[PDB]
Structure 1
Amino acid sequence: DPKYADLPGIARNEPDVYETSDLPLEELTSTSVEHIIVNPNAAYDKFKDKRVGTKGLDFSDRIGKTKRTGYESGE
């Protein structure tokens, strides 16, 4: 504010801001696929009581037995 009187070249009637007028998905609806609504509650209730037995399993490239099938037991 007092920079007008103490300084010579600080003019008035200056529009400080020169501006312009501040002027103001469809792929899932296909007939090919069957869109499924994912529900974590229903799927969680489905796989709620299904155990997995990991007693002595392997997945690596170890060849000692004939075959190798991990996740043997359940409930």
Structure 2
Amino acid sequence: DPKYADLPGIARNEPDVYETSDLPQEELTSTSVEHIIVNPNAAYDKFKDKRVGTKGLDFSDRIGKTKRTGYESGE
């Protein structure tokens, strides 16, 4: 504004930002899906107490005693 005052060639009456007056899932809805929550804390506390024993569950290209099984020990 003071610059506009001090500058003679600068005219006025200008709506500066000239603009355009602009004015302003289904898979679950199938005949066969059953999307169910496991109730994370419920199933978690359930399987949580179920201890799991392991004893060197080792398998990668390991030769000796052909059959192997993960979580070897018991708990």
TM-score, normalised to structure 2's length? 0.79
Contact preservation (8 Å) 1:52, 1:72:
no
Distance in structure 1 (CA, Å) of the matches to 2:23 and 2:31: 39
Structure 2 unaligned residues grouped into runs of 5+:
none
Q: State whether residues 28 and 35 of structure 1, in contact with CA within 8 Å, keep that contact through their aligned partners in structure 2.
A: yes
**Residue by residue, what CA displacement relative to the aligned partner does 1:5-49 show, whole Å, maximum 9, x if unpaired?**
321221111111211223122221111222212321121122021
**Contact 2:54-2:74 within 8 A present in 1 as well:** no
Distance 2:71 2:4 in 1: 84
Question: How many pairs are equivalent?
Answer: 75
The answer as to whether partners of 2:57 and 2:69 remain within 8 angstroms in 1 is yes
In 1, are the aligned partners of 2:57 and 2:71 still within 8 Å (CA)? Answer: yes
Q: Which residues of structure 1 form unaligned runs of 5+?
A: none
Question: Quick one: percent identity of the two aligned structures?
Answer: 99
Q: Quote the residue 1:8 is aligned against.
A: 8
Q: Which has the higher helix share?
A: 2
CA RMSD in angstroms comes to 1.7
Query: Could you tell me the TM-score, scaled by structure 1's length?
Result: 0.79
User: 2:52, 2:74 within 8 Å by CA — same for their partners in 1?
Assistant: yes
